[PDB]
Design a binder for these strands. Structure first.
Ligand code: NA
Ligand code: NA
Ligand code: NA
Ligand code: NA
Lengths: 206, 207, 207, 205
DNA sequence: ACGTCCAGGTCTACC
DNA sequence: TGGTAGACCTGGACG
DNA sequence: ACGTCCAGGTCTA
DNA sequence: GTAGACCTGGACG
DNA sequence: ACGTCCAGGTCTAC
DNA sequence: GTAGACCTGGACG
DNA sequence: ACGTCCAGGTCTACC
DNA sequence: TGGTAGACCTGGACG
């Protein structure tokens, strides 16, 4: 079933948007360290939150993610109506240790290894949001596994149950099921995601 | 307790001034830039199984080059500067550049002991000996440099029963502890301390 | 990994029988009076910073003396029978006599972990270790005895990064849980598990 | 170190060593057959145990002299000696000097006699030759084995545990000890028992 | 030798 | 609070 | 007189 | 945990 | 447990 | 001057 | 209405 | 350990 649904989206004029988006990421090969970092923050802000809200907050704050004091930045987040302003603001500041994120990430063996580094070395980033970062900046063979695509995987029965938790072991299992699915629909991991996400919500945000 | 006898022997000499101004030299790194810090990390990598002064010279000649120099070029520089392991050390140095702002990364940690834990497992080229070396050099007080010299100095006074071929983190941590006890006894920080014991051996107070 | 290996080969050795005859020696406390249990509780108080062997004869020579002998005479016996702390341990034993029906008090508690909590804050001389040691010695399994020894090899086998100064309740229940997983990876209750781990370093199977 | 030895000359141990040193002197009146059994004992102590060789020397007894090659190798084999084959061979070959007492005594001193033994018997080098001579009553040869050597380096008398204790080694060390000797006022033989006991807490031979 | 090392921790008293 | 330095205290093993 | 031993360890398989 | 690999010039007798 | 540690060196070749 | 060989059997954790 | 639902998780403390 | 509970924390649409 899921296969069928995606097949027709690849046909529908939705495929036209997903690739203005997929390439919207690829262009990060020509973006600055601040931009890349601003994307990392977007991921940190997105966890257990809303994409729309995340987009606003990002555009509204801009390079404030990289110049605002912990107390001043914290307040702005309070303004734009973010669920968790205290915590997420703490992560932003703390993350500045790696403000040259583009150079740090582009220097790893691959993407699977780079993801490993962000998780354990950035408070606020698990596998969900690291995969999200990598993707949003050009990376194809990583999967983002949040509530939604979980739901489409439990629903279409690819997974037994919606895990009370997501160990690294499980994330890499599922991410693979996702990978094998994408060979049939013939999409890289970065693309597929947007497709399943769109089904679920009805928006090719990011 | 002969070592100790020789330690206080030094504390009451014109050597204490040299060491005391040497320690102050490191403590000034609190104001230096990320560059002056990365360039110090490299010096350590250079000094691994090499000459202390041999690494002091190369650091002078290359200077801000540790940041810019490409692989094949920096290799030429080193190869010409007479370093033993030009290829390998050149390799490591370049990789370390992914942390070209090594100050933001180090000061972000809660304590030096944990900061070392990071450096040791994210920078190929750095183990405990040369991270302790690194940190100490940029102004931290509570870490020990457990090289060959201070090792068979300990050993030579029965602080240990053998010179182990390789140092386990548990092994290095245990040895360090041992040094700190001397530290308390003689009243000095593992930073100060290390310059002393090092001097009892070689006769020079470099770094 | 090595520790895991040492264990199972013991489970196949002559030792897998001495420990077993020993484990059911504890379970047989379900059919003993308060006094016999108290005698055990007393044995554990004697063991704090002392020998397991020593506390076994002292309890055998003194027998049911922990219940009748006045302080002065008890301390005297504990002095003659050569106990490290003949005064303090003599005091604890007397104060505990306000629970000389210890069996009725312990079995009353829903379980074991909750009963252990009662022994610790309500009896001088009994900390978390010599509390778990008592319950285990009277037939309880899901509690670990974390003494100088089982600490030595947990640290030697890289399970913990240090031998802590003193064991806090959180640190105890934490390490106790580290042992609890070690248990299921070889299939042994903490009680039985303890004896294997203890025989490794001491080379004996007492209690 | 010297402080420790003084503590020993104080203890009951000093009496234990006096009666032991006098057990060696008795060889002045023992037979060629006896002097040889000690020689064999010393051949069974090289890279082996002092206590092990003792019981072996006691069980085998005069067997070192009358048992055929293969027979002697069996008793050594059974008595759990590390090297039954070789030691039996060394013992058998040495039987050509069965009247070892006559030969040793005929020499000028101990220093020259030991030289003959070493060169003229397979299985015997300096330590064993010294060991031998000490055991029969001779007083100024040092036995340099793993322990008296251990003690000497741990105490900064020598600087390396030489891989190969050369004759030129054995004798520089032997001289050092002889100087450690005047410090405490002991014969090389008495001193060896003192140093050995420190290492081993046993005082046999 | 004589001193060092070491045994299935728990307690008070301090800040 | 809750983490920690000192007190309790002795006999045997071992170089 | 040319050969040996020494220098602030770390990484891979 | 460990040996081989990385690599060189330099002072000593 | 079983694998390493350990014990009063001497010989034979290259 | 120096590896390999001779060769094992108890203790120990 | 206004009490429910829901949104691209991850960290700490605890065992 | 590595899993689990519980915190972080709110707005906006539903009906
Ligand atoms: Na993280
Ligand atoms: Na490293
Ligand atoms: Na208590
Ligand atoms: Na010979």
């Amino acid at each position: 079933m899921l296969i069928k649904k995606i097949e027709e989206l690849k046909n529908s004029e939705i495929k036209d948007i997903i690739d203005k988006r997929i390439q919207e990421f690829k262009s990060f090969k020509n973006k600055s360290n601040e931009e890349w970092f601003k994307e990392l923050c977007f991921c940190i802000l997105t966890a257990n939150f809303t994409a729309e809200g995340g987009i606003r907050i990002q555009k509204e704050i801009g390079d404030g993610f990289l110049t605002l004091p912990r107390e001043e930045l914290e307040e702005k987040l309070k303004n734009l109506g973010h669920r968790f302003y205290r915590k997420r603001a703490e992560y932003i500041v703390l993350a500045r240790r790696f403000k040259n994120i583009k150079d740090i990430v582009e220097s790893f063996e691959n993407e699977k290894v780079a993801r490993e580094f962000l998780v354990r070395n950035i408070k606020g980033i698990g596998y969900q949001e690291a995969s999200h970062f990598l993707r949003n900046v050009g990376y194809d063979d990583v999967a983002i596994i949040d509530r939604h695509i979980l739901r489409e995987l439990y629903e279409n029965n690819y997974i037994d149950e919606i895990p009370k938790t997501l160990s690294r072991r499980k994330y890499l299992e599922i991410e693979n099921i996702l990978r094998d699915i994408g060979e049939e629909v013939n999409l890289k991991l970065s693309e597929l995601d947007l497709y399943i996400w769109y089904l679920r919500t009805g928006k090719v945000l990011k």
